[PDB]
Write a protein that holds these residues in place. Structure first.
Motif, PDB file in Angstrom:
ATOM      1  N   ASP B  49       0.826  -1.205   0.000  1.00 47.95           N
ATOM      2  CA  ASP B  49       0.000   0.000   0.000  1.00 47.95           C
ATOM      3  C   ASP B  49       0.863   1.258   0.000  1.00 47.95           C
ATOM      4  O   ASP B  49       0.541   2.237  -0.685  1.00 47.95           O
ATOM      5  CB  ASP B  49      -0.939  -0.019   1.211  1.00 47.95           C
ATOM      6  CG  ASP B  49      -2.172   0.852   1.018  1.00 47.95           C
ATOM      7  OD1 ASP B  49      -2.028   2.066   0.767  1.00 47.95           O
ATOM      8  OD2 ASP B  49      -3.294   0.314   1.123  1.00 47.95           O
ATOM      9  N   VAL B  52       2.235   1.555  -3.542  1.00 51.22           N
ATOM     10  CA  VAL B  52       1.214   2.062  -4.460  1.00 51.22           C
ATOM     11  C   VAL B  52       0.955   3.550  -4.215  1.00 51.22           C
ATOM     12  O   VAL B  52       0.781   4.325  -5.165  1.00 51.22           O
ATOM     13  CB  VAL B  52      -0.064   1.204  -4.335  1.00 51.22           C
ATOM     14  CG1 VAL B  52      -1.284   1.882  -4.953  1.00 51.22           C
ATOM     15  CG2 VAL B  52       0.160  -0.144  -5.001  1.00 51.22           C
ATOM     16  N   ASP B  56       1.688   6.449  -6.883  1.00 50.30           N
ATOM     17  CA  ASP B  56       0.660   7.413  -7.265  1.00 50.30           C
ATOM     18  C   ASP B  56       1.170   8.841  -7.106  1.00 50.30           C
ATOM     19  O   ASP B  56       0.836   9.720  -7.911  1.00 50.30           O
ATOM     20  CB  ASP B  56      -0.601   7.192  -6.431  1.00 50.30           C
ATOM     21  CG  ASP B  56      -1.826   7.864  -7.029  1.00 50.30           C
ATOM     22  OD1 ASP B  56      -1.751   8.327  -8.185  1.00 50.30           O
ATOM     23  OD2 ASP B  56      -2.865   7.924  -6.338  1.00 50.30           O
TER      24      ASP B  56
ATOM     25  N   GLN D 514      -7.135   0.382  -0.382  1.00 49.27           N
ATOM     26  CA  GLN D 514      -6.851   1.764  -0.735  1.00 49.27           C
ATOM     27  C   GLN D 514      -7.660   2.158  -1.972  1.00 49.27           C
ATOM     28  O   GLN D 514      -7.866   1.330  -2.865  1.00 49.27           O
ATOM     29  CB  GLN D 514      -5.353   1.936  -1.001  1.00 49.27           C
ATOM     30  CG  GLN D 514      -4.887   3.364  -1.249  1.00 49.27           C
ATOM     31  CD  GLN D 514      -3.443   3.440  -1.703  1.00 49.27           C
ATOM     32  OE1 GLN D 514      -2.907   4.526  -1.926  1.00 49.27           O
ATOM     33  NE2 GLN D 514      -2.805   2.284  -1.846  1.00 49.27           N
ATOM     34  N   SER D 516      -6.591   4.068  -4.274  1.00 49.00           N
ATOM     35  CA  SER D 516      -5.659   3.997  -5.393  1.00 49.00           C
ATOM     36  C   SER D 516      -5.466   2.571  -5.891  1.00 49.00           C
ATOM     37  O   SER D 516      -4.959   2.380  -7.001  1.00 49.00           O
ATOM     38  CB  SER D 516      -4.310   4.599  -4.992  1.00 49.00           C
ATOM     39  OG  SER D 516      -4.450   5.955  -4.607  1.00 49.00           O
ATOM     40  N   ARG D 517      -5.851   1.573  -5.098  1.00 52.90           N
ATOM     41  CA  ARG D 517      -5.757   0.172  -5.483  1.00 52.90           C
ATOM     42  C   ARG D 517      -6.974  -0.313  -6.259  1.00 52.90           C
ATOM     43  O   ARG D 517      -6.996  -1.470  -6.690  1.00 52.90           O
ATOM     44  CB  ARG D 517      -5.567  -0.702  -4.238  1.00 52.90           C
ATOM     45  CG  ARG D 517      -4.216  -0.557  -3.566  1.00 52.90           C
ATOM     46  CD  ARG D 517      -3.199  -1.506  -4.173  1.00 52.90           C
ATOM     47  NE  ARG D 517      -3.538  -2.903  -3.924  1.00 52.90           N
ATOM     48  CZ  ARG D 517      -3.151  -3.586  -2.852  1.00 52.90           C
ATOM     49  NH1 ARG D 517      -2.410  -2.999  -1.921  1.00 52.90           N
ATOM     50  NH2 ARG D 517      -3.504  -4.855  -2.709  1.00 52.90           N
ATOM     51  N   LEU D 518      -7.979   0.533  -6.446  1.00 49.11           N
ATOM     52  CA  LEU D 518      -9.177   0.120  -7.166  1.00 49.11           C
ATOM     53  C   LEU D 518      -8.959   0.269  -8.667  1.00 49.11           C
ATOM     54  O   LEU D 518      -8.610   1.361  -9.130  1.00 49.11           O
ATOM     55  CB  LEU D 518     -10.379   0.950  -6.728  1.00 49.11           C
ATOM     56  CG  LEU D 518     -10.745   0.891  -5.243  1.00 49.11           C
ATOM     57  CD1 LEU D 518     -11.958   1.760  -4.950  1.00 49.11           C
ATOM     58  CD2 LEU D 518     -10.992  -0.545  -4.804  1.00 49.11           C
TER      59      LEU D 518
END
Lengths: 281, 148, 713, 597, 262
Positions: B49, B52, B56, D514, D516-518
């Motif tokens: 996480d 990621v 981002d 999260q 952003s993980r979708l």
């Protein structure tokens, strides 16, 4: 007045070679396309063969084919040349008058059997190797009286190949298609500047243009004269041969001409050394 | 191989949602991680996480600031340049990475879209044509080397 | 202020080094005098649409137009639809040529295939008819586009037809009174109005109407060609410049513009090397002002010299001058401009250092010019820049890189915990022994390096080599193993365009049919009808469940149109071990090309279970550590070192050198055959093949690949 | 129809490419066939082409032959594009119905699978009756689940037609229990198939909670079906190529295959599933007869279950009476005994009876519209409410009733409770809309609900953040790595570590991912009726547009009625509700003629 | 050897930027005109290029629509709508646009306004709300401390009977098609789009310009007011609809000049 220089010319060259292979190799029948496939697998092998001649100055081919001879006429000529030897073998079969030597084994009639099954059709292009046993220059070294052996030796004197006509048509077509495409797109190349200046000096009015160059720079000091294309020396001979008040200084080294792969040539330097009178070291 | 690693890194920056491209880009020699690190990154969900989230953030910098700010933030946060300089034989790899970054920044100003630069990089990987700017440079000048 | 000789060459580097600074280091910048770039995929697509009859209609040039969201949104094509159309054009055999009349227009023979109309007919026949039915009009259908997604094909066929019409529209030459609604009709036909792209289409209409108004102001009566208007619009679209943020407050980035001298405190100059500055513009040659110059005549060289003088005078506090002195490619000396050379000559002849008060004139000049010249390092991570003194770098990101106090890259091989499960399928063992390093990467840590797919070629396939030739040989071998009609498969492969056009495709099909018939005469000489059987084994407490296809009572029969390789031998040996362990007394045979044959005799249950337990131990060893078992190079080393006559390995120096020669030949191949070392899975572990890892690969291949050559006959 | 007149460019280019230089009759026939294939009709009858086309005399003046080509069959067979089934032609005309070659091949494959391969597996009737008595406790009157299980274990290929809330999964569990208890020594590799991943997850959790209830053995628990797979994953479908792993050569090594929700199975996927089956596997299809049609072109389950209204055979009635031990009625007449025997009809719903108005409204949907008006009219059964939606004040009243429906969700959201109860309260009330955009659609209703939550103090939303606390999202693509499927809901909230989206897994746990993980995220305050299939909601509210659209038909309102457990609300006009019931989404196919002979 | 990198002690620069107002923020009818930025700029260029003294010629409107690229059917309604706008007076005494000579008018006055203090929004919005009556609602905008120059482009400045007046053009007006564009709706549009700050900066710039140019200048004697002209709201029967005349309190201008000066 404005033109776009391109760095890589291989893409348009491959496109023109593909266009030549489309407009020359597609409507051929099977008996010609078999020999074309035996010479090259596709247009890529032909481009790999002629890529050292497509760029730069186009070379002069020794004993070129005539302009009206196509692939079919050459194929029919070689087919008739093979069929004449086949007829002369079919007429003079069934005899043996030569003396048997110690090197010559008695299995040659079996090789004649290999020449017995060879004459069925003229659809092939490759003759048998046993015809090399029927040569008068080889049988004498191992007594040939019939002219069939001399006709076989005349058949095997030159290789029966369609390669030279296709290479000549490719050198006549691909460069013209590349020049036409660059004239349509308005682009220019590195050697195209040399070719344009040589074609301008080749004309009648362009000589006066050379006088304008004599108006522009009435001197020339040319460094690295070993790396000189024949177009470059033809230009420099067109401008600064024997006119007064202009000087030409060819500063070079014939022992360093190592760029023959790029387009340079030491025979141009030897022609320049034969043309000029004074030498300094 | 460094151009393919940079292509994988740009594909992981552009699409950080799919974990397959990010996992293929993190295990490259440019990051320099062991198999135990990749296994613990696949096992721990919170570390993935964080990865990621920072990718981002790299995508936000890449959309706002350009190619070279994102690449400099990636080489400064992961500290991969110091690890490549500490590794013997990695200085040439670092100069190749810097030259690929300079060429991507030079080609990225002439393109509006972000995926277009990735397609240009994949095309130039698939096109081995040699230009005067796209050739390999000298890796070091201070250290004396045998010049072939 | 920072002035560059050319703004477009240095502006990416300026933006790159000004955006990369952190928040404590960031200073605001504003770049002026650059070329105005507003919308590239609108203007460039309109320029490409103005070259529509002159274009060859290559598939990449149409997919680049479909990459534009305006042209895709006009014909209701989405990004997912574009991603489907990429592989549809790549697999449908669409290379170049919109129509057959376009092929006949370019003085080329009408082949009838590999065109846009051929691919459209192929996709519509695939929407109508399955690919197993056969050809209809010598066009094999395309079985991919079958459902509603082939509606996107109806969008693409809606595009190219329009790309025909203007191809017949823009060919004829028209006078200037007829070119007025042409660009407007092109804009409302090919493009859709949007919020972002409204100003680009407005600028296109404004420039087009301005060009036609400037033409009709002179009342031009003759015809005007299309390419002239295209070149004029391409020149007028790039003529615009931007200078709005010249003095906003951020630091100014602009080129040297004449008759503009503003006093600044710090004036910096970039690109002052020779050739770049001063910018030389050659005269037209037939201009009379260059022949007889007057007082009021203006030239660009004198304007650049006066600009350098105004930059010297206009600097109040500090003047910075930087030029490229050493080449980044070959470390060649790049000389500066003549203006900077005269400036440093006047500096050296007008000033002297207090250290050497009276030494010489030329030596003091050279000492001043060497004290002013700061030869910076080639790389930013050099420790010379971070040495304390006069100059010191402010880049804190390269400070630990220059300090050399970082840990090195550790090895990727690490002992990982792995427990062998109860039920391990046969497919997992086959995928492991097909490639062990890939199975360690993509299954244990799930890292599969996915390379991008190959782009669409620009021409029709004249030769057959690679994956397409292997698929053709595979289908021909599967057709000839049942004694089917080879001519029907020839017509099927010719209707899809995978074969060369005309006689060359017939020659290729004849030689491939000869080779596959020579292989089939050995394959069906000992072929018996066999069915697929089940495999349920228990070895070392491990369950193996799977299925073996085409199990004949003679044994195992496999055929592939490939060469003699060790990976197929390992696969056949694994199938023979999994076949002989549960009944099945018989040989196992595999027939490759060029009279290559892998044979294994039948073995007992004990030896088969022992070798299967050895392969299971190798599988559980390959998941913890990367099992360095190279099939090709390790098999070549082994078969160079193995002796089948005495069943023992030789240890002399000549065999140990020939095995190293075979290992270096199979690892890194020649310039025509791709070697085994050129792979994305092997370059991650090591960059250079060390002899220690080479001996490790040799030991692992001697441990594992030994029953391959031990039971080979 | 209205959409049938506006020709797609695909149909026009297909007609211009296939016919080409032929007669314009072939061009018009190819265009009409491509348009009917795009709309979902499998076959094209020549009576509609001959009568309902204004250019039909004009093409009669176009053709010029000896026999003048008066018949459409001779005019189509004269061209090289239409054959009788021998030539490799795109269009096929066999039974006075024109189709494409792929559709004709798949239709003949389905007719061969449902006419010839469906044989009768003869087993012991006494042990089967004993297992049905020991599994089904009700033996006083006629139970359709026992007859369905008996006729599914008797024959090889069987279709179980039943609505939601009728206890279909319990019948599947009893069928599998009697199947394993019948064949003790014989191994049975039971496989489960689903069209979507969310329905596969629901099938796995339902059969997991159903099969652990029935008493089994240590060898019987070993033969429990492990997982339910997608139809693209079971057959091995690839993203790039359409080549399957089990296409024609190697069949799937299965003993029995239970395919749930066959209403969403189109004709090419059904034909690809049929060609993968061996000569000994027994297939059990699940789904509702009156449910919504398939996604792509084709209607398999409706054309199969259309013959279920005729009844069983005379011998099959005595067979079912000997098996179940009760009185099974017989069907009058015999047209296709195999298909009529393989079918079954479930009418006794267990989760709702005749006292609830939902089942009566679902029974009145298939009848005339006046029956549905009478069902809504008298006393409303305290379950179904009807609200007229014509103007803006009715829209404000609909938003107020949606506030009253989402009241417990907002109360659990504002009180800062656990996310499990928040998802459990959100899964009780749901809006169902027909279209996507405009004032009546997905994105219109979502933006209007977000603006109404911005107006009244219920949900605080930042305009530039897009990830405010309390937004419901749904995934559009499958992702097996994250564990979420297509059609799964998630609620974004702040647990204390940041704004994360919580998803309710079918295993009983909750997963915090999260944002952003979708991979995909769309607002789901109102779902479409096509995308809400398989799920169940306690309080559903249908919103139909006032504009006449072919999406709103009988099957859409039937799936909207059966989506609600207890409470259902309606927001539509009376004329739209009267027109949607009469306009049935019929799909012309050759299965009506192939099964009749 | 040990090596370090130097660190900057302070910020490299203050917030200095030369910005504008936008940086700190039957079948044929004008109601059926397409609403956008490009038709708004087209109508602004039409009102800029047209002379106010001469009558509007229809062929000139057709030529301008040919140059712009709009439909030719809109032209005979466009010329009569333009003459209906020009015939409508916009003043407290009833002065039309046709009475303005060429020397009196000045179109698109570009001004640069200096400010040496950090512009605080809280110290400025309270000073605006102290005097401006339209600031009853309108919660305050947030912007950074802007020190430097401010750009501005006034549409029209014109004098009449020895009194100066300002005129600006707003032409979006998408949400109104009926006659509901009264003074309350126009005041709500001024409060929503926040044109009060733009008009106040325009009054400050015009006050400084008339102070620098004309000697012995008084703000109450020479300045008359600011007129906003909504193009789609002008009707023939309603002279008040479409125009919006506002006069400041003449005490906000001096305090704003003292704030912007230092």
């Amino acid at each position: 007045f404005e033109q776009q220089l391109i760095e890589d010319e291989s893409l348009l060259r491959y496109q023109a070679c593909a266009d030549f292979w489309r407009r020359h190799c597609y409507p051929l029948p099977r008996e010609i396309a078999q020999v074309v496939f035996e010479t090259w697998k596709g247009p890529q092998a032909l481009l790999r063969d002629i890529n050292r001649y497509l760029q730069g100055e186009a070379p002069v081919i020794k004993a070129p084919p005539p302009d009206d001879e196509t692939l079919a006429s050459r194929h029919a000529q070689i087919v008739a040349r093979i069929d004449t030897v086949k007829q002369q073998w079919r007429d003079a079969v069934g005899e043996l008058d030569a003396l048997i030597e110690s090197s010559g084994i008695d299995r040659r009639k079996f090789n004649r059997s290999n020449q017995a099954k060879w004459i069925d059709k003229i659809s092939a292009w490759a003759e048998e190797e046993t015809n090399s046993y029927q040569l008068p220059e080889s049988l004498e070294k191992f007594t040939p009286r019939h002219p069939l052996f001399e006709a076989i030796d005349q058949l095997l004197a030159e290789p029966l190949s369609i390669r030279d006509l296709v290479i000549t048509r490719a050198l006549a077509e691909i460069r013209e298609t590349v020049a036409r495409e660059k004239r349509r797109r308005g682009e220019l190349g590195f050697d195209d500047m040399l070719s344009r200046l040589d074609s301008a000096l080749r004309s009648e009015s362009g000589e006066v243009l050379a006088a304008a160059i004599r108006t522009r720079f009435p001197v020339a000091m040319i460094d690295e004269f070993q790396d000189t294309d024949p177009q470059q020396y033809r230009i420099f001979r067109r401008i600064w041969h024997h006119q007064p008040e202009t000087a030409l200084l060819l500063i070079g080294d014939p022992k360093q001409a190592i760029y023959a792969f790029r387009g340079a040539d030491i025979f141009t330097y030897m022609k320049a050394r034969s043309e000029v009178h004074a030498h300094y070291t | 191989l460094e151009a393919q690693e940079m292509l994988w890194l740009l594909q992981a920056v552009m699409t950080p949602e799919r974990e397959n491209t990010l996992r293929s880009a993190l295990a490259t020699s440019m990051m320099g991680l062991n198999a135990l690190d990749i296994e613990t990154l696949n096992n721990d969900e919170h570390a993935w996480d964080v990865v990621v989230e920072e990718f981002d953030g790299y995508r936000q910098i890449w959309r706002k600031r350009g190619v070279m700010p994102m690449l400099r933030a990636l080489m400064s946060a992961r500290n991969i340049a110091e690890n490549l300089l500490a590794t013997a034989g990695g200085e040439r790899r670092l100069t190749d990475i810097l030259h690929i970054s300079e060429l991507l920044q030079e080609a990225g100003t002439q393109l509006e879209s972000e995926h277009a630069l990735v397609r240009w990089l994949s095309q130039h990987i698939l096109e081995p044509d040699s230009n005067a700017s796209s050739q390999q440079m000298r890796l070091e000048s201070d250290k004396h080397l045998v010049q072939i | 202020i920072v002035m560059v000789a050319d703004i477009d060459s240095y502006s990416p580097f300026i933006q790159a080094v000004f955006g990369s600074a952190p928040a404590d280091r960031y200073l605001p910048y504003a770049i002026s005098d650059r070329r105005a770039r507003q919308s590239h995929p609108v203007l460039e697509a309109f320029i490409s649409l103005l070259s529509l009859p002159d274009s060859r209609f290559v598939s990449e040039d149409v997919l680049a137009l479909l990459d534009v969201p305006v042209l895709a949104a006009r014909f209701d094509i989405t990004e997912e639809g574009l991603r489907y159309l990429r592989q549809w054009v790549n697999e449908s055999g669409i290379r170049w040529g919109i129509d057959d009349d376009n092929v006949r227009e370019l003085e080329l023979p009408a082949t009838g295939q590999h065109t846009w109309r051929f691919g459209l007919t192929r996709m519509l026949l695939g929407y109508a008819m399955e690919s197993a039915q056969g050809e209809w009009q010598s066009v094999l259908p395309y079985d991919e586009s079958s459902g509603l997604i082939a509606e996107l094909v109806g969008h693409l066929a809606s595009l190219l037809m329009q790309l025909n019409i203007w191809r017949r529209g823009l060919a004829q030459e028209r006078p200037l009174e007829e070119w007025l609604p042409v660009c407007r009709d092109m804009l409302n036909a090919f493009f859709l109005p949007d919020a972002e792209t409204e100003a680009a289409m407005t600028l296109i209409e404004q420039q087009w109407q301005a060009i036609i108004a400037e033409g009709l102001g002179a009342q031009y009566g003759d015809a005007v060609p299309l390419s002239l208007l295209r070149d004029e619009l391409a020149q007028r679209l790039d003529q615009e410049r931007i200078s709005q943020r010249f003095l906003a407050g951020p630091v100014n980035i602009c080129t040297l513009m004449p008759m503009r001298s503003i006093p600044f405190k710090v004036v910096c100059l970039l690109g002052m090397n020779d050739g770049v500055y001063p910018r030389q513009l050659a005269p037209l040659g037939f201009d009379l002002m260059s022949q007889k110059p007057k007082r009021g005549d203006r030239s660009r060289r004198d304007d650049d010299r006066y600009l350098f003088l105004e930059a010297l005078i206009s600097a109040q506090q500090k003047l910075y001058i930087s030029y490229i002195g050493r080449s980044i490619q070959d470390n060649s000396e790049r000389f500066p401009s003549v203006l900077v050379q005269e400036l440093i000559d006047y500096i050296g002849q007008s000033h002297y250092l207090p250290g050497d008060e009276a030494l010489n004139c030329d030596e003091s000049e050279a000492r001043v010019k060497a004290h002013l010249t700061c030869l910076h390092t080639r790389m930013p991570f050099d420790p010379q820049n971070y040495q304390p003194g006069e100059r010191q770098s402010y880049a804190r990101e390269w400070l630990p890189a220059a300090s050399q106090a970082g840990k090195a890259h550790s090895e990727f091989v690490q002992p990982l915990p792995f427990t062998l499960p109860e039920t391990v399928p046969l497919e997992t063992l086959q995928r492991f022994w097909a490639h062990p390093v890939r199975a360690f990467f993509q299954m244990r840590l799930q890292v599969n390096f996915r390379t991008e797919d190959s782009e669409i070629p620009d021409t029709e396939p004249f030769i057959l080599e690679g994956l397409s030739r292997y698929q053709i040989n595979q289908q021909l071998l599967n057709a000839l193993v049942e004694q089917d009609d080879a001519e029907r498969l020839f017509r099927r492969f010719r209707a899809a365009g995978d074969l060369p056009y005309g006689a060359f495709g017939e020659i290729f099909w004849e030689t491939q049919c000869q080779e596959m018939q020579q292989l089939a005469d050995r394959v069906i000489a000992c072929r018996q009808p066999g069915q697929s059987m089940e495999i349920d084994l228990a070895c070392n407490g491990v369950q193996i469940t799977g299925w073996l296809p085409q199990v004949q009572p003679d044994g195992l029969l496999r055929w592939r149109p490939s060469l003699l390789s060790v990976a197929q031998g390992m696969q056949l040996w694994l199938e023979h071990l999994v076949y002989c362990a549960s009944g099945g007394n018989g040989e196992s045979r595999l027939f490759l090309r060029k009279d290559g044959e892998w044979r294994f005799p039948p073995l007992a249950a004990e030896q088969a279970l022992h070798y299967l337990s050895q392969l299971i131990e190798g599988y559980r060893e390959g998941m913890s550590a990367p099992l360095l078992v190279l099939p090709e190079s390790g098999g070549a080393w082994l078969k160079t070192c193995y002796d089948a006559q005495n069943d023992a390995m030789l240890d002399d120096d000549s065999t140990l050198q020939k095995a190293r020669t075979k290992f270096l030949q199979a690892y890194e191949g020649n310039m025509m055959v791709r070697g085994e070392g050129d792979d994305i899975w092997y370059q991650r572990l090591w960059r250079q093949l060390t002899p220690e890892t080479m001996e490790a690969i040799v030991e692992q291949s001697q441990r594992f690949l030994l029953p391959l050559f031990r039971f080979n006959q | 129809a209205v959409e049938h007149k506006q020709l797609r460019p695909l149909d026009v280019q297909f007609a211009l490419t296939v016919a080409g230089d032929e007669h314009p009759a072939v061009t018009l026939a190819a265009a009409l066939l491509s348009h009917d294939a795009g709309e979902g009709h499998v076959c094209l009858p020549l009576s509609r082409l001959e009568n309902n086309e204004a250019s039909h005399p004009l093409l009669a003046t176009c053709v010029s032959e000896i026999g003048e080509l008066q018949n459409w069959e001779e005019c189509l067979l004269a061209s090289q594009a239409v054959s009788r089934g021998d030539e490799p032609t795109p269009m096929i005309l066999c039974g006075d119905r024109l189709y494409l070659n792929r559709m004709w091949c798949n239709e003949r494959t389905v007719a061969r699978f449902f006419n010839e391969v469906n044989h009768a597996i003869e087993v012991d009737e006494a042990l089967l009756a004993q297992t049905l008595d020991k599994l089904f406790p009700v033996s006083d009157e006629i139970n359709w689940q026992k007859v369905a299980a008996a006729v599914a274990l008797t024959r090889r290929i069987s279709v179980i037609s039943g609505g939601p809330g009728t206890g279909k999964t319990t019948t599947v569990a009893k069928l599998l229990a009697a199947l394993i208890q019948m064949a003790d020594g014989e191994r049975c590799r039971i496989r489960l198939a689903a069209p979507t991943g969310k329905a596969a997850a629901r099938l796995t959790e339902s059969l997991g909670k159903a099969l652990r209830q029935l008493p089994l053995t240590d060898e019987q628990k070993k033969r429990i079906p492990e997982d339910a797979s997608t139809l693209h994953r079971l057959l091995g479908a690839q993203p790039g190529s359409q080549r399957l792993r089990h296409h024609a050569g190697n069949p799937l090594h299965l003993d029995v295959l239970v395919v749930d929700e066959a209403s969403m199975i189109d004709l090419p996927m059904m034909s690809r599933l049929i060609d993968a089956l061996p000569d000994h596997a027994r297939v059990i299809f699940l789904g509702d007869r009156d449910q919504l049609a398939s996604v792509e072109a084709g209607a398999v389950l409706g054309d199969i279950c259309a013959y279920a209204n005729a009844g069983f055979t005379a011998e099959r009635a005595r067979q079912l009476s000997r098996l179940t031990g009760t009185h099974v009625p017989a069907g009058t007449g015999t047209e296709a005994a195999s298909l009529r025997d393989s079918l079954c009809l479930l009418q006794k719903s267990y989760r709702f009876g005749s006292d609830s108005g939902i089942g009566q409204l679902a029974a009145a949907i298939n009848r005339g519209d006046k029956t549905a008006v009478k069902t809504v009219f008298q006393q409303d059964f305290t379950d179904i409410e009807k609200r007229l939606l014509q103007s803006g004040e009715d829209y404000i009243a609909m938003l107020e009733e949606a506030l009253a429906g989402y009241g417990r969700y907002l109360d659990l959201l504002q009180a800062r409770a656990e996310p499990d109860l928040i998802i459990q309260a959100f899964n009780e009330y749901q809006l169902l809309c027909a279209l996507r955009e405009g004032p009546f659609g997905v994105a219109g209703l979502n933006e209007r609900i977000e603006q109404f939550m911005q107006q009244k103090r219920k949900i605080h939303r930042h305009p530039h953040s897009r990830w405010y606390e309390g937004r419901p999202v749904m995934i559009a693509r499958n992702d097996s790595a994250l564990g979420l499927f297509n059609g799964d809901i998630g609620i974004a909230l702040d647990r204390g570590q940041g704004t994360r989206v919580w998803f309710a897994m079918p295993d009983g746990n909750i997963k915090s991912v999260q944002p952003s993980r979708l991979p995909e995220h769309e607002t789901t305050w109102a779902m479409t009726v096509h995308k809400s299939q398989g799920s169940e909601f306690d309080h559903a509210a249908l919103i139909l547009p006032s504009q006449r659209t072919p999406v709103v038909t009988r099957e859409l309102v039937y799936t909207a009625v059966t989506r609600a457990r207890r409470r259902l609300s309606l927001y539509a006009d009376e004329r739209i509700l009267s027109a949607a019931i009469a306009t049935r989404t019929e799909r012309r196919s050759g299965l009506a003629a192939l099964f009749s002979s | 050897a040990e090596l370090n990198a130097k660190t900057l002690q302070r910020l490299p620069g203050d917030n200095w930027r030369v910005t504008s107002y936008s940086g700190l923020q039957p079948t044929l009818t004008p109601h059926q005109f397409p609403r956008g930025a490009s038709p708004g700029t087209f109508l602004h260029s039409l009102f800029e290029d047209l002379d106010f003294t001469q009558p509007v010629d229809p062929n000139w409107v057709r030529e301008k629509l040919e140059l712009g690229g709009f439909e030719s059917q809109w032209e005979p309604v466009l010329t009569e709508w333009i003459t209906a706008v020009l015939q409508a007076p916009l003043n407290e005494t009833g002065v039309s646009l046709s009475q303005l000579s060429a020397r009196n008018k000045q179109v698109e006055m570009e001004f640069y306004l200096p400010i040496s203090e950090p512009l605080i929004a809280s110290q400025l919005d309270t000073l605006i709300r102290q005097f401006d009556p339209l600031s009853a609602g309108c919660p305050p905008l947030e912007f950074m401390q802007v020190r430097g120059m401010l750009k501005g482009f006034i549409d029209l400045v014109f004098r009449h009977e020895g009194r100066y007046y300002l005129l600006a053009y707003k032409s979006n007006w998408l949400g109104e098609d009926s006659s509901a564009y009264t003074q309350q709706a126009m005041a709500a549009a001024m409060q929503a789009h926040r044109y009060d700050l733009q008009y106040q900066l325009y009054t400050l710039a015009l006050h400084r310009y008339l102070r620098h140019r004309i000697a012995d200048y008084d703000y109450e004697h020479h300045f008359g007011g600011v007129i906003y002209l909504f193009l789609r709201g002008v009707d023939k029967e309603h002279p008040q609809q479409g125009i919006y005349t506002t006069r400041p309190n003449a005490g906000l201008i001096a305090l704003m000049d003292e704030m912007f000066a230092g």
